[PDB]
Amino acid sequence: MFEIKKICCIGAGYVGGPTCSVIAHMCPEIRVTVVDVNESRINAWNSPTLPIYEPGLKEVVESCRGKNLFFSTNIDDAIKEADLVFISVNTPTKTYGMGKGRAADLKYIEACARRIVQNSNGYKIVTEKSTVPVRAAESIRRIFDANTKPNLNLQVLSNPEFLAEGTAIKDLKNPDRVLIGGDETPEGQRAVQALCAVYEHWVPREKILTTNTWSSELSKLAANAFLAQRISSINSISALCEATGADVEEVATAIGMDQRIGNKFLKASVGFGGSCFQKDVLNLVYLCEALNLPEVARYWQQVIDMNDYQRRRFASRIIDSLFNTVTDKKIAILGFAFKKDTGDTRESSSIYISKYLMDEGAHLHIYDPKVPREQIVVDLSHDQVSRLVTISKDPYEACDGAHAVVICTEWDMFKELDYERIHKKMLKPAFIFDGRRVLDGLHNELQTIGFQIETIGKKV
Amino acid sequence: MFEIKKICCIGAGYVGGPTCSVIAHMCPEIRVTVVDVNESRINAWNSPTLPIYEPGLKEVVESCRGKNLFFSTNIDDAIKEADLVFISVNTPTKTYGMGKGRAADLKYIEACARRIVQNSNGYKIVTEKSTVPVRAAESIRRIFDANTKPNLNLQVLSNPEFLAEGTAIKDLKNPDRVLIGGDETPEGQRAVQALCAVYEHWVPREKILTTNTWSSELSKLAANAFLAQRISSINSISALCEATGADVEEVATAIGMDQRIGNKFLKASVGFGGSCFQKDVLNLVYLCEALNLPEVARYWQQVIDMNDYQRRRFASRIIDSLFNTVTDKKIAILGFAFKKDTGDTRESSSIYISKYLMDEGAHLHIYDPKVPREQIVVDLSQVSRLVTISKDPYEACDGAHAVVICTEWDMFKELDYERIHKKMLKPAFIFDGRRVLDGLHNELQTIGFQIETIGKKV
Amino acid sequence: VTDKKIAILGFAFKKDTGDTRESSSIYISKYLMDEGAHLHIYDPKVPREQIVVDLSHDQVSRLVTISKDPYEACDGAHAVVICTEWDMFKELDYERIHKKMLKPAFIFDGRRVLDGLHNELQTIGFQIETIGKKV
Ligand SMILES: O=c1ccn([C@@H]2O[C@H](COP(=O)(O)OP(=O)(O)O[C@H]3O[C@H](CO)[C@@H](O)[C@H](O)[C@H]3O)[C@@H](O)[C@H]2O)c(=O)[nH]1
Ligand SMILES: O=c1ccn([C@@H]2O[C@H](COP(=O)(O)OP(=O)(O)O[C@H]3O[C@H](CO)[C@@H](O)[C@H](O)[C@H]3O)[C@@H](O)[C@H]2O)c(=O)[nH]1
């Protein structure tokens, strides 16, 4: 009855950090070491202020770091001394070659695999842990099969993480379900059981689903695409609301009361973001094209096309509402993160709205509570960032002297802003573009204040 | 407080009929009369055997027919007498004009509004209650605006119906929500409250949604589109599973367990049928095209296209497995209804699979416990040469090359497959389009069957 | 194939000549170059300078190397791509080539020259793929 005592995780990211921190917290007698090549990131995980923002993570991490949980960058000894090894690195979409701008680049998963083999002896369980697993588990096993040592016995499992950034701790503390994939051998089922026992410390038996490696990845690929589809479906409906004169918040409620559909993920928005959804759908389309399933690839493609359209339509409305020029006009961008309560910008619609407006000559003022200043400048370029982009220290700075305020991220605090103060210093007429619906019910207040408030899924 | 006391309902179909029979049942003190042009149909609504099969429906109707609920062809008098007039007539898709085979025809709706006006005096609330409402309430209000009598005071309302056929009685007795669309006038809100108060007899107040006319019709369209998309998405995954050795049922479980997705409506199938989904999606597309939203049109069009693909892929697998020749080969089709526990065959998947096989010259033998023989011969119209309606499943499999399962009748598991296989031609194939035979796989294989099912391949 | 060493054995359009004009080796090389591979080309007769010319419009500087013998082209390589039927390629020491390759070690026989060598190469440990025949 193999029991896991030492866990090494390769990847100190939004997935790896939080996951292992909870595993450490819930399991005191099992030592968990998180390793990364990025010294900066590891130093931060060891300091008072962490490298990522996640509600509740500070308490989790500080309650068992140095008792039971470690951060090292010494990848070699952690691997050597471990029973289970997570691979939680990133898989960027390729920038050249076939599958450019679509297919996932497995160059880090492979390099990891290769290093494990170099530093491993005896038995070890290697589990692939990611948001979007694209032929991950197979790649690893392919490396291990071909690079065997004497008395080395490596098992490959799949274990896709379902956490959502912003609510990671809650999700990791109480997940809808846990998904472990491993070979339908007896070698095999034993490694699955041994990981199953890890989770059985805080997740009950019948919430842990055990299937085969591939099924597990296909399950994650599909699940991510279904959720992405809901957001796009309601976003499509939001477009229809605007041309006909209904409310998408109202239409969404009517929909959501059907228990077969359910009421979650029906908030219309400027466009879904994050390192998952788009990457997931593009890789699902690519997979399908490779298996000669054009019809299926054509079907899921629409989830991307619709998201693009949502972003582009919202943008045109801004320029449209400002007499078809924003040249030399000051515009405030409130919220830069892809979603609330996180520092992460990857694939954020704020990045897209900002760029589209800069191309029309707007002087932007960006504010976000938790996105670092340096990140914003990177995202927004590839010098024009010098001329047009300023980074504000508070919302009211971004708004002073501004022709319009664009809300891109549903930060709670945005509802709580002093709007009498903001209107007073804006140039008139002052516009608010709510790309998140966060200012519903506030309509009347804001109009009477003198605003021309334009929001998605509702047209004047 | 305007109190409704007499209800008339033009259209006694799979919607008009049950809905009214339940309204009547829930409210003893209010008279419900259901009218229809079709004489044959109205006589069946009064007879021991109803014109539609729907579980629970018989005990419900025969608890208040001739007492609170009446069924009559005398339309002109039910209207004259009623405070509330439901419009539950079918809207076939236009066979000609701009938007042939896409848009819905509003000629029956328009001839109702004309009939209403003639036989109407005083205040009356007119309510459009259908499953795919397309600009419906706006066509009615428009006829009312044009033809104005002295002291006529008609109020138009939208009350779409969320019942699923085969579980209609449950869905009506205990709905998820009721949706009432009225004009944002005070005239208006008085009209909405009266109807709201009819439902308050059995429906809790926080399950009744009040909105304007259009916001109600758009929500219905969306609502049916969202469900159809669910089936098509899991169907697409089924194709991908067959190409890669996974199981769509196992995948649907893992997907379903996410509380933000929901576990309902993720059963992969030969494809969705019903008088709703296909009509509903195509209409949404047509609207979007009309409003200059080609982006939105193309998106929802993928729900229909995936469904066409799933059906066609299923048809090809059958043909393929029989060496690409099915001339004079007996095939059993089990299940002609679009779903289980109904006799409705509108847009049924079994129609399309059947016709594909028929194009290959196959001799078809069809069985359904509830679908009228005549309905099958109409739906497939060659008929004389290839199609036979079987009176029991075993006479459909006697000497057949393949058994094809299209409807999820509970009677289809539990068949004596020992007996079926003995009299079948080998190789004996079973094509399970509904996953009804799950679990039984090993039994069927040792019996000697080659069992093929959607979302899983050898 | 970013940063992956791959040996290109043969660059001539066919055996017993140094002519490279419209050789498949130029295309296979360019396709693998677009993947960011580090190519090490060997040919017994094709001049070194002619190769770099055929592989040009800087991408060459970063990605191409010309090998003086086959064994340096394969030393630490991920795959051996045979593109020209030089008789010498059948005669190579594939025991030696393997011990210094990165695994999985691949041989892509574009010319069918390693026929009848398949069992020796498999037991040695190569995953040998050829045209006109698949696993
Ligand atoms: O109703 C909604 C919900 C979300 N979004 C947007 O979509 C994006 C994604 O949000 P979310 O899904 O919560 O963040 P993720 O961290 O990407 O998490 C999702 O994707 C993860 C992998 O990234 C899965 O593991 C999780 O289960 C799933 O919740 C955000 O930009 C949101 O604004 C909407 O527009 N409307
Ligand atoms: O997981 C599933 C569920 C259903 N179906 C099929 O989809 C079609 C339609 O199913 P169903 O929705 O149950 O029948 P409907 O009578 O069309 O009912 C739906 O459509 C109505 C409008 O027609 C709405 O009012 C209802 O709320 C909605 O449940 C049928 O052929 C089913 O077999 C599947 O293939 N897979």
Numbering used by the authors:
A (entry chain F): 1 to 382, 389 to 466
B (entry chain E): 1 to 381, 390 to 466
C (entry chain B): 326 to 382, 389 to 466
The publication says:
UDP-glucose 6-dehydrogenase (UGDH; EC 1.1.1.22) is the sole human enzyme that converts UDP-α-D-glucose (UDP-glucose) to UDP-α-D-glucuronic acid (UDP-glucuronic acid), an intermediate sugar in carbohydrate metabolism. Molecular cloning of hUGDH revealed it to be a 494-amino acid protein that shares 98% identity to bovine UGDH. hUGDH is a hexamer of 57-kDa subunits that assembles into a trimer of dimers. UGDH is a member of a small group of NAD+-dependent four-electron-transfer dehydrogenases. UGDH catalyzes two NAD+-dependent oxidations of UDP-glucose, the first reversible, to yield UDP-glucuronic acid in an overall irreversible process.
